[model samples]
Target: PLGSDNVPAPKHLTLERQLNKSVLIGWSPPEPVGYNLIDSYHVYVDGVLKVTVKANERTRALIEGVDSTRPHRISVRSVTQNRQTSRDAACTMIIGRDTAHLGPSAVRASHITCSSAVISWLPANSNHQHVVCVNNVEVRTVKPGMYRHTITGLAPSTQYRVTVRAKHLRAVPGAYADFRTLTKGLPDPPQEIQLEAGPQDGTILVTWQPVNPVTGYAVTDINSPTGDHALIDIGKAVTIRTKSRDSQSADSAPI
Candidate 1:
């Protein structure tokens, strides 16, 4: 090995748990044949750069935010601060679900308020743990035996979806249920809003901060392309009529 093979490769790899659209990788230190020959390590998956591990960081890493539904090939290599390189060792590809057990049952939403809602679900058929995600962002991971979560800091007169993900050998996400924060039958005069003119004439697009809750979620497997959702256009419609005539209209004033 040249240059004393300093900046040794990552050792002891394990892909133990798969959750939250990610997997955990645990490892141990490497002996870079020479002392002070390295300053950091680069972690790659399937021959592509995934992240850089600076020296003195923890050996164990939770390879998270990975969206693929299939197993991935990963490897670690040594590098120096002076841009000096090492072929010293070489590259290795990384390697890469579980089944059984259903999703949470009877998921419910209650505790409606101007900015919060409490979601609860019955335990799943299995005895594994559970997690709660509001609008697909994991809000909380629960203990093995409990179910019930409150999401706060929301906007009124808005809708939001809730998902209860149960952790098993495979974290197949169950469809989400939705609920809206109450408007208290009132909406503070809309302020801090956005209005953009549509490409065509007479179309004024209106928007505001703190987007309203909407329905939809993403489902992915370690082996498939990233999951995505499509927006269905409800169409643009507008009409004016005597106060009595427009009450049943779809785009009624939010007032």
Candidate 2:
């Protein structure tokens, strides 16, 4: 039999554990061991020759510097004494990152208030601190093993995305949870209410600092119930009475 024709490809290629940038692979010798007698094994990664393992009892090879995030094509072939190589025995696999717990997992938000919320997650990676982010902004960095962080100074009645990242990498994604702040009853009232007499008789100007989250203001006479009712979109208005109503559909209160 011809040396090249009789040489059989290695069989049962298997991808094993991935430790960081390294991967372990194993294979079984061909069925017949061929007529030329297999003397060596050639390992190829992604169509490129990676290593040449001397054919002893060792049928395993550890390849280093492998990118675990992407798929890889690993192939092995038996080489005869006359340098006759057989057909490739190949397998494709994506050796995902090790289960060392590099990032936060099972993230959640709890104890939500009108102005704050508590973000928590199942923690890992003591060497890397956890970063708590709200709406894509880094709010705080907590010590390792501290699985929870309180985010303050948030606005009321606003939706927020809370993410807990274990490392400082911006590209790497982490665990995230969505929540909304509770409504704080009414919108803040307009400040510094002042009344200025107009140049024309029987006319007055009602002026005040418009509070945020306020759509409009309702000015009414203090003397009469619902007297001189005037609704102004802007801060100041003419021909209006003292005291202004802060507008919020569910909860409106007077200033």
Candidate 3:
């Protein structure tokens, strides 16, 4: 069998618990062990490759100095004889402390517009600076006594999550607020226009396909604001005759 010497990744990677600032991570050895002897294991904390551990019958490692109040990503891979390394088996876990107490609180969003919004929060501590994030990406930093920030360049009618985290604190989890932007566009246009030429009566008939739930219709002359314009009650269509020789137009009611 070709590639039979390749090692499989660690299995059942798990975060057992946090003891003080140290977190205990455990995993099982790869099944159907390869022909080569298991040499060591590679551990990764957050996203950074970390300490190499000689297996020697040990399947767990105690990592120190990890933040207990926030989440951490832990990954492990198998290293075997012949220098073969397996893919990572990973898990995410939050350790011991009460995360909400380490970050901001009472997060709120207001005055949301088509392209902008305002986010505010009460800091866990008044002396701590903060960073504002939109949908997980950092957007702005707030000084220690300031708790509100305005962000722009967002799309209209989109949903977003805003969060605030205390500055330089890996122990802090983000406090979040969610909202959707206002829709900013004109109402849909009336569809399917029809025209009839009445030669003997000296009049022109205009009609259009109706729009749903339309409040009303405005019948006006072509390019004429003040020239022969009339308001008609709500319906699927309207019938407008020539007030003069000029053409006519039908439009959905505007707000």
Candidate 4:
């Protein structure tokens, strides 16, 4: 039982398979043969001879344009001078679909003001698309559902609920989803601001008391005879004190 040494036999052949996150299938080449008496090698995949290379060339092949959602089998073999065939090395690769995304959820609202109210909501998993680039967010009032939908024109002293939906542009009819938001009415107006008369200087001092923690003060001045009006602003939390002189008006007029 003697083997023919002149006929080169396949030796040290190995197969490895890898699946990339991008749904691609990859394979590692077989080990090199030190002998110079080689002729050619054959590469096969799933029992099909996809490529053939010379003895000096590497033994590797890539199968492109494969379906990502399926399982595939790959095989490779080497051929030497004198028509000697090597045993086949095989591997298996499975491709699967990408993970699904969680829609937006947990919506709410707050910060009601005299002219407008702020609406905010908790975002969903959004594993793929975040708030800024979300497919579409439609806000609607819970009551009439059609009365006022500008989202910026809601009454200041009123309570309302809002719903927001998120979905992709290519989504189907059932793709859109919804979230909820609840808000309160605006607080009462601040106390009346008082303006003091100026002395010889033409400047007028104004003051007011803050009724709310986040309120700012606005002051308007009117000059009846000259038909001129001026405006000034002061902090609602601080007491403003200042003095001014009027050059033309008499002290007895109204100081």
Model 2 ranges with Cα > 4 A deviation: 1-97, 100-102, 168-172, 186-255
Report the error of model 2 at residue 127, Å. Answer: 3.8
Clashes in predicted model 1: 10
Q: What is the TM-score of each predicted model, taking all chains together?
A: 0.33, 0.34, 0.34, 0.24
lDDT by residue for model 4 (1-255), tens? 112223333432222343442222223343445653446655544455666667565544445544445543333344556555543421222223431233334444445444444444322211112222112434442221111123455543444545543344242211222222222332232234455544435555544433332323223433232222233433322232111222121111111
Residue 211 miss distance in model 4 (angstroms): 99
Task: Point out where model 1 deviates above 4 Å.
Answer: 1-99, 169-172, 184-255
Q: How far out, in Å, is residue 225 in model 2?
A: 33
lDDT of each: 0.51, 0.62, 0.60, 0.35
Tell me which of candidates 1 and 4 scores higher on TM-score: 1
Put down candidate 2 lDDT per residue, 1-255, tens digits, no spaces: 212435765655667676767789887777674286778988877667788899885899999777777655566767887788764322222235454444666789888888998887754332347789988999898763356678999999788998887675232258889877766875433335666555566665556554433345455423322232333333342332223244333322333
**Which consecutive 10 residues in model 2 have the weakest lDDT in total?**
88-97
Residue pairs with clashing backbones, model 2: none
**Residue ranges of candidate 3 with Cα displaced over 4 Å:** 1-101, 169-172, 186-255
- Once all C-alphas are superposed, what RMSD does model 4 give against the true structure? 26.5
Candidate 3 whole-model C-alpha lDDT, 0 to 1: 0.60
